[PDB]
Design a protein around this ligand. Structure first.
Ligand SMILES: [Ca+2]
Ligand SMILES: [Ca+2]
Lengths: 44, 98, 49, 44
């Protein structure tokens, strides 16, 4: 299930990955996460 | 009570101001997760909280306020002990309302 | 937090200043002179044609 | 399945995590557990 729900303003970087990226890194144009979930479903 | 062994103390930043202008980090080794009552054994520095959460990660943080240029105090965690020493710079604000 | 620095008067030079507050993480600014203008003060004497 | 149902007054901190935290930390407002199951289904 959910692994490591991280902190107040993290993204948890995938439900099955142990990574925390700040919210400022979401849809920044860079694949910070290994899975790249941060760049998925961009452009609302 | 959790068993605490090899407790070390380092101070990230210090500034002798009226508000709590100190950050204190404790490293420790534990067997179980519990609650320890944290105290400082001198009036040169005053801690902010009385109890802290000890976890298997091995890092807790405390906030202290001091008025001396270079404090030195003995902080305890459950039954352990350590000696904390730091260098503090003066604050720039002339007057505070508290 | 008062700070002071000296930056060159060269157009396009990417000057960066480092502010290190004792209680906070260091900060880096970026200042740049896009354009400069030197205006004298004139007193007309006469006109010729 | 059940792996570390450890002690008297723990919550086992998730069905698949290697953690035991005291029952006093259930619904305390902080994510003590790695998964965060301690703050799930709170407010009865
Ligand atoms: Ca990104
Ligand atoms: Ca909790």
């Amino acid at each position: 299930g959910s692994m490591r729900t991280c902190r107040i303003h993290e993204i948890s970087c995938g439900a099955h990955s142990t990574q925390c990226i700040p919210v400022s890194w979401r849809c920044d144009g860079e694949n910070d996460c290994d899975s790249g979930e941060d760049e998925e479903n961009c452009g609302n | 009570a959790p068993t605490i062994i090899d407790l070390t103390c380092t101070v990230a930043t210090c500034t002798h101001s009226s508000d709590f202008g100190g950050v204190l980090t404790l490293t420790y080794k534990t067997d179980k997760n519990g609650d320890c009552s944290v105290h400082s054994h001198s009036n040169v520095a005053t801690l902010q909280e009385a109890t802290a959460k000890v976890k298997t990660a091995g890092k807790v943080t405390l906030h202290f306020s001091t008025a001396s240029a270079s404090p030195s105090f003995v902080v305890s965690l459950c039954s352990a002990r350590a000696t904390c020493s730091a260098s503090c710079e003066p604050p720039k604000d002339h007057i505070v309302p508290y | 937090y008062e700070h002071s620095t000296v930056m060159p008067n060269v157009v396009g030079f990417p000057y960066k200043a480092h502010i290190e507050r004792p209680g906070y993480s260091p900060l880096t600014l970026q200042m740049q002179v896009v354009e400069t203008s030197l205006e004298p003060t004139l007193n007309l004497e006469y006109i010729t044609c």
